Structure 1
Amino acid sequence: KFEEKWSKILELLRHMVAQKVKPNLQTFNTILKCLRRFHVFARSPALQVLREMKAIGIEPSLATYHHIIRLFDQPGDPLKRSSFIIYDIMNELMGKRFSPKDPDDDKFFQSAMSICSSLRDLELAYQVHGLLKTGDNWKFIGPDQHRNFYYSKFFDLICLMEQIDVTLKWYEDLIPSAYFPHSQTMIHLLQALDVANRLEVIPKIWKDSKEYGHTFRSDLREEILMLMA
């Protein structure tokens, strides 16, 4: 159980101090990564580990916060603790240029955007994306499949929670230059156009859909026809 594992970990930390061994950033990042198994019991302990880092002087990297949000963000409807964590993390990370410190630094942005979609907070999503755009932070987005997930969750949240006039600006900037849309994201864009009563754009969405490899997607073709008729 967690309590026994926590005691063991703490015992190793006490062995580390006894041997005059100074902990590095990876020491704390592994603890947080290990603490993911006991998701609901390690939340407060994990926060204690983070608070210890700042006191010692080890600066949390993107990987550190990635592990925390993954630990705090489990399948729960309230997301009350998750709400507080992400808001506080974003306030701390605002306008911070990052450099590669831990191999898991590239996984923060996809996880941060996933929580923003779960909370359905567009202002938080713009803060996460703002952090990506400052300086050279854009290079931490990660491999291709990470980039597609991040942008899928990001654009799906824009369409749902923002005015149509701004959604169409984000649509033009991100597609195709940033990512190629999934067939489901075109459906979300069509639904956003419906809610806004801007159905003169539906013919354009079809043309773009054919250009992005969704010509023969049954779900997309049925949605467009139904909305038009």
Structure 2
Amino acid sequence: VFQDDPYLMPASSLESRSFLLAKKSGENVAKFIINSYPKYFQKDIAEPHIPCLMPEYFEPQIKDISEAALKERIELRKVKASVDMFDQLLQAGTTVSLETTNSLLDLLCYYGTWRAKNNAERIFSLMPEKNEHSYCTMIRGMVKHRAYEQALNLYTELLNNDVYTFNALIEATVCEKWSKILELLRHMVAQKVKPNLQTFNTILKCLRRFHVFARSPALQVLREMKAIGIEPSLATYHHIIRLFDPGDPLKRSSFIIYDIMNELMGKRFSPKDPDDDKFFQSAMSICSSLRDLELAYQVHGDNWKFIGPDQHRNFYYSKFFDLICLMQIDVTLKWYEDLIPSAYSQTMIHLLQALDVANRLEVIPKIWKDSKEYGHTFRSDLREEILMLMARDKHPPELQVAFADCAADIKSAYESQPIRQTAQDWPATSLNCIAILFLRGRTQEAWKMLGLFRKHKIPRSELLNELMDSAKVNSPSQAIEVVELASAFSLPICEGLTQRVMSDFAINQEQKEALSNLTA
């Protein structure tokens, strides 16, 4: 969906989101222009007539109560229905058809809040003829758009006089209630409805949180589901996996569910429940807590559509790469360097600590360069982390050139942004390792950089060590005009200068030695 050139190449999750949202907004603008000026695109130049390409017609026809009623279910709104009820009740006083009244009630309950109150209190004027369909759709509406006492009253009225109707009724009853839940389940199973288990899914959704006294009975309820043999175990299974949430991991149940989802993966899947999108995200959320790599590989035909939203995809990939990092890591970095362009701070931090524990120093540069190429700019948390981890090292002598290069790039990025004020406190935190790496070939750069640092300070023990190594690595005056100044500045450089002045520094001139004596 994204373009190929590098400039248009979306190099971050938020900007990519905004980009394809702008594309969708252009699609909506196209819809608006076509449905505002249909006559322009009315020409059917293409030989195969396609209603997908034909302009769209939400235009009410002339006043015609019967055809207007038939067009009600075509226009998909509520003002037309109000006007039609008005025309049929006030002056006509007749019903075009009970099916038409049922469809009107369907639409009005779907559309639903004082407006919902008015829409629900304006349906009782409907002609006496109100069958089950009408009553149970009123229940549907009062449940999924308003409070639950009204739905309960309507259900009692119906009893005095469907699968997802009773589903909504159970939702209303539930949303501690032990006897309620029990009698509900009992009479529901007693009736001959034979639900599609969406009632069970909804009662699970309501049981999202409870102790073992309903977490464990869910297992036998699922075993009964399996015995009747209806459920694919797509959503209720995942919801009980989530309900397992937790002061202590349950390794036994974890292994059991591992085998279960293993055979579920082995078999082929077909979608039936609209809530299979939270499946992916919360499943990987539980996987992250579990921390297992064979588990991650198991969780990894066209079942990749259930990821959907970029937020859930982000959570999944983040937890996946985090587990893979915190698991050698050669195969992990292989998988990563394979999926980085397709895939999208915390992940990079985990990568840095994984590379540290691995000791693969040569890899971190390329990773930092990739992050910078994509979106890593105007933030120094990861810069601090990489600098500390890379200059805790000095063991590669030839790699000091790469140290200097990446340090120069890091400083080029660090000094970009004055107006923001955020670049002022970055050197105070991470300039020490940067300057040490610069010292480790080129030295004048690090010299003047430490000058700028101290002339911005927060001295440090490794800063003292840096100053000492720099001074000892031939030029007395060039070393003095730095070490003596930093000593006059602060006391630890002075207690180090006490020793520095022995070799060849104090013999040059006494005015700076006099200043040192005064400060000491």
Tell me which interval the TM-score lies in, with the shorter structure as reference length. 0.7 to 0.9
- 82-91 vs 113-122, which moves further: 82-91
- 45-54 vs 59-68, which moves further: 59-68
Unaligned residue ranges in structure 1 (runs of 5+): 130-134
Shift of 1:110: 1.9
Cα distance, 1:48–1:204 mapped onto 2, change above 3 Å = same
Distance between the aligned counterparts of 2:379 and 2:220, measured in 1? 49
- Is contact 1:160-1:188 (8 Å) kept? yes
1:20 equivalent in structure 2: 192
Deviations 1:49-87 (A, max 9, x none): 2111101111234212220111012x3233345524532
- Is contact 1:98-1:137 (8 Å) kept? yes
Cα distance, 1:31–1:89 mapped onto 2, change above 3 Å = farther
| TM value normalised by structure 1 | 0.86
- Is contact 2:349-2:385 (8 Å) kept? yes
Distance between the aligned counterparts of 1:150 and 1:83, measured in 2? 19
Distance between the aligned counterparts of 2:216 and 2:260, measured in 1? 15
- Is contact 2:242-2:286 (8 Å) kept? no
Shift of 1:220: 0.2
Cα distance, 1:202–1:137 mapped onto 2, change above 3 Å = same
Deviations 1:19-49 (A, max 9, x none): 3110212111112211122144321111122
- Is contact 1:107-1:142 (8 Å) kept? no
Shift of 1:18: 3.1
2:321 equivalent in structure 1: 155
Shift of 1:189: 0.8
Cα distance, 1:10–1:24 mapped onto 2, change above 3 Å = farther
SS in 2 for 1:62: coil
Distance between the aligned counterparts of 1:88 and 1:200, measured in 2? 40
Cα distance, 1:9–1:84 mapped onto 2, change above 3 Å = farther
| TM value normalised by structure 2 | 0.39
Distance between the aligned counterparts of 1:76 and 1:146, measured in 2? 25
Deviations 1:74-131 (A, max 9, x none): x3233345524532332331322222211111222222222222121111111011xx
- Is contact 2:284-2:316 (8 Å) kept? yes
SS in 1 for 2:341: coil
- Is contact 1:36-1:42 (8 Å) kept? no
- 33-42 vs 194-203, which moves further: 33-42
Shift of 1:169: 1.3
Shift of 1:164: 1.6
Deviations 1:114-159 (A, max 9, x none): 2222121111111011xxxxx0111112311000001100011111
Distance between the aligned counterparts of 1:178 and 1:39, measured in 2? 38
- Is contact 1:156-1:185 (8 Å) kept? yes
Aligned counterpart for 1:105 among listed residues 276, 280, 284: 276
Cα distance, 1:225–1:88 mapped onto 2, change above 3 Å = same
- Is contact 2:285-2:319 (8 Å) kept? yes
1:126 equivalent in structure 2: 297
Q: Does 2:311 correspond to 1:145?
A: yes
Distance between the aligned counterparts of 1:202 and 1:17, measured in 2? 61
Cα distance, 1:59–1:17 mapped onto 2, change above 3 Å = closer
Q: How many residues align?
A: 215
1:31 equivalent in structure 2: 203
- Is contact 2:249-2:290 (8 Å) kept? no
Cα distance, 1:144–1:91 mapped onto 2, change above 3 Å = same
Aligned counterpart for 1:206 among listed residues 368, 376, 382: 368
Percent identity over paired residues: 100
Cα distance, 1:201–1:44 mapped onto 2, change above 3 Å = same
SS in 2 for 1:145: helix
Give the superposed CA RMSD: 2.8
Using CA pairs below 8 Å that are at least 6 residues apart, which structure has the higher relative contact order?
Answer: 1
- The structure having more radius of gyration, on CA atoms, is 2
Which portions of structure 1, spanning 4 or more consecutive aligned residues, are displaced by more than 6 angstroms? none
Q: Does 2:341 correspond to 1:170?
A: no
Cα distance, 1:77–1:19 mapped onto 2, change above 3 Å = closer
Cα distance, 1:11–1:88 mapped onto 2, change above 3 Å = farther
- Is contact 2:325-2:350 (8 Å) kept? yes
Cα distance, 1:219–1:97 mapped onto 2, change above 3 Å = same
- Is contact 1:65-1:89 (8 Å) kept? no
Unaligned residue ranges in structure 2 (runs of 5+): 1-175, 390-519
Shift of 1:212: 2.9
Distance between the aligned counterparts of 2:377 and 2:253, measured in 1? 39
Distance between the aligned counterparts of 1:171 and 1:144, measured in 2? 19
